[PDB]
Paper text:
However, the microsecond spacing of MHz XFEL pulses raises new challenges, including possible sample damage induced by shock waves that are launched by preceding pulses in the sample-carrying jet. We explored this matter with an X-ray-pump/X-ray-probe experiment employing haemoglobin microcrystals transported via a liquid jet into the XFEL beam. Diffraction data were collected using a shock-wave-free single-pulse scheme as well as the dual-pulse pump-probe scheme.
We compare the quality of the diffraction data, as well as the crystal structures determined using the single-pulse and pump–probe data, respectively. Crystal structures extracted from the two data sets also differ.
Residue numbers in the entry:
A (entry chain AAA), B (entry chain CCC): 2 to 140
C (entry chain BBB), D (entry chain DDD): 2 to 146
The structure:
Amino acid sequence: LSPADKTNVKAAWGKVGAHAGEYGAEALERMFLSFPTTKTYFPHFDLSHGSAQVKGHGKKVADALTNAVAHVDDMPNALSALSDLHAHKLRVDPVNFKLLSHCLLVTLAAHLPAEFTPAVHASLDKFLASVSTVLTSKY
Amino acid sequence: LSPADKTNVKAAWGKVGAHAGEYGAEALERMFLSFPTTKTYFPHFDLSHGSAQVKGHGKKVADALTNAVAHVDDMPNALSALSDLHAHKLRVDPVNFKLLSHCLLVTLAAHLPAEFTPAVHASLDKFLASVSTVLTSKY
Amino acid sequence: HLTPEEKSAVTALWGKVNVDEVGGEALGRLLVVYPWTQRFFESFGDLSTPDAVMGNPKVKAHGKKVLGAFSDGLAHLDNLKGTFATLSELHCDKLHVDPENFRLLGNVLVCVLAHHFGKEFTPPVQAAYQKVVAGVANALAHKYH
Amino acid sequence: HLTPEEKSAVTALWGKVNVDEVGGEALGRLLVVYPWTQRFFESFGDLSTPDAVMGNPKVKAHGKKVLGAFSDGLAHLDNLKGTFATLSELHCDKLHVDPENFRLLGNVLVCVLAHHFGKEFTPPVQAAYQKVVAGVANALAHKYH
Ligand code: HEM
Ligand code: HEM
Ligand code: HEM
Ligand code: HEM
């Protein structure tokens, strides 16, 4: 990531703040309704609106993205355990990282209108593309 | 790449040798005939069969890949200039690297049937993927 | 492929779309977020920075034409292959645009609708709009298949 | 859409294809080169290593049935959407396979035809077969549109 993209990502994610866990839950809900093939990965979850488990898993996805922002420079080593889970154990199809990234971008657009510029949009896409690259790096 | 991957790539590309540029030229020809959208990036070229321009470019691509194998552990710094050329100046669509990677595999297979085992197939595909990621890194 | 409550929600929201500005915001965002796409719009002029792209008057003007094509698609959801036969020919035989880029403009359009409607752009509404844009991308891709 | 001299080179080469081995070869390479596709085939047994996959009797057997569907598609290149209607329903509604994977199996088949036929697999022959495997891939993905 370029110095300008790091500054733009930190600006945007700063303003998300204490609502990150809530936005992580909305992104997972949007993905399951819009791309219903992704549901085959959560057969052990209640995937109805306001499910305790989806709220629970929203916080886990958000805390991991906050970590990735604090370690943007050493992402491969910050997420290396999550790269093992998603490739080796779970066997997640790489195409599915692009569907969740799109659903996160739709969630931030809807909550942060003032912050979601063309410039900031572009930098957040590169950032989520970087996070997806690491999470599929055991392939 | 993994230790096993590095070994399979070095061993396969060792047994290409002098034929490197001949093989590169064939891959470009296979690309232009199979995927006709890629012909628009070379308007200043004679793209007819047995073309002198394609043979000379063939050898440039081949030499670029030999360096990448020889610097397998420092790939972003052995291909730094070519990302600038491909991403910033030429605006090459990222789908197109996947089409060339595939025609490069159909060439190595037609010519080295003994060396083109399924494990060596897997190793070359990860290598050309890695080369493709570096060349698109300025997006 | 849209339930009765879907088609009503899609239509209801569309009517409130600023037709002058949404299509130019979506085409502008495609060109900034996915820069390889800028080589097809060389003759539109200055696309050197994000602020050049958004304010470029040819981009705004052409953005209205794209949004018009989408409205025409929404009117004929049961016959999209027939409505976009001429445009598919333009993009596929003449301009040589990879069909993956059609999916990228559809997804960028969904981002822009969420930017403008915020809370109203609910997950069930988003899911109806994804089917539509997938519908349009597959119809523009027909002359390749 | 193939020319007469394309369709005659596609049909000529296929007659020489060892229908027993190539099918298992194509299915085995997909599972080894793109390891996420193994989760669709859990009941086939041991896919832990490349030697376990290639030498796996259920993979070898299932390969014959895939190649046998490719052999029926050539016969009916003018009605693929029809030929592949039942398999479209199976792959998209029951199994939930991402259509990106259909293209990968088509491309792995092309690398295998190249491996066996060598210098007889000419750039113009490959461009004809790349038209077939895309046309197959699209036909399979119809139930998603
Ligand atoms: C930016 C993208 C993603 C991030 C940051 C992410 C992060 C995480 C985290 C932090 C966990 C919990 C790990 C733990 O339990 O210790 C997890 C689990 C999981 N993720 Fe993801 N994930 C991402 C994308 C995906 C995608 C695209 C899929 C599937 C389509 C997926 C499927 C799963 C599944 C099935 C689990 C295990 C759930 C369970 O058994 O409790 N993830 N992910
Ligand atoms: C593994 C993938 C690739 C490698 C290693 C590669 C390598 C190279 C090299 C070494 C050059 C010449 C640089 C010089 O002047 O010294 C070059 C030029 C070029 N490449 Fe690539 N390339 C790749 C993929 C692609 C693809 C997929 C496209 C387009 C579809 C493309 C389009 C071009 C063009 C247009 C030029 C400039 C030709 C000219 O005007 O002189 N490249 N490439
Ligand atoms: C769903 C996606 C799309 C729709 C609905 C769409 C629609 C249109 C329409 C209505 C026109 C004007 C036709 C005319 O004036 O004759 C047009 C022109 C054009 N489109 Fe698209 N388009 C789409 C995607 C794309 C993409 C992704 C690209 C490039 C990456 C592209 C490149 C062009 C170009 C270059 C022109 C011609 C502009 C000129 O007059 O010089 N289109 N499109
Ligand atoms: C692209 C061309 C493909 C063709 C022509 C094809 C063909 C077939 C055929 C003929 C069957 C057997 C149907 C029956 O007799 O009941 C089948 C089953 C199946 N296919 Fe495919 N297939 C393709 C791609 C894929 C891909 C890409 C995947 C997964 C990544 C896949 C996964 C399966 C699975 C899981 C089954 C069910 C096998 C069982 O458990 O009995 N297919 N396919």
